[PDB]
């Protein structure tokens, strides 16, 4: 991902590059790079733990948004 800098504003170019590396999904894959080898029997365990964490976050965000949207829209 290449970003041109205009008028010598390096901070704007770096922010644009960071956001584009974010929204292209390449930051997720660049953090998902492994240093060692993991077997499939450990990939299953890590995926299960990921799923449990995701379910807990879904419940938290559901309850938070419900109690926000009850109050905010005239109630």
């Amino acid at each position: 991902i290449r970003v041109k800098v205009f008028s010598g504003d390096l901070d704007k170019a770096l922010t644009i590059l960071q956001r584009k590396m974010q929204s292209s999904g390449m930051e997720r894959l660049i953090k998902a790079q492994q240093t060692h080898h993991i077997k499939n029997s450990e990939k299953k365990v890590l995926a299960r733990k990921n799923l449990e964490r995701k379910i807990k976050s879904i419940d938290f965000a559901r309850k938070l948004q419900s109690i926000l949207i009850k109050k905010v829209r005239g109630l």
Binding site: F60, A61, L68, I69, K71
Partner: protein, 47 residues
């Protein structure tokens, strides 16, 4: 049974009450993230 089946042949008696229609309008994919909705609840809703 007799009377309720009679009164179905009348005006619109199957009208949703205000509370049920308001909950339907309250409800109408996924949600906002926790770190986003918490920032919204940290900035606003303190009144």
């Amino acid at each position: 049974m007799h009377y309720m089946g009679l009164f179905s042949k009348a005006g619109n008696i199957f009208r949703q009450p205000r509370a049920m229609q308001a909950s339907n309008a309250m409800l109408q994919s996924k949600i906002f993230v926790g770190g986003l909705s918490p920032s919204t609840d940290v900035e606003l809703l303190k009144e």
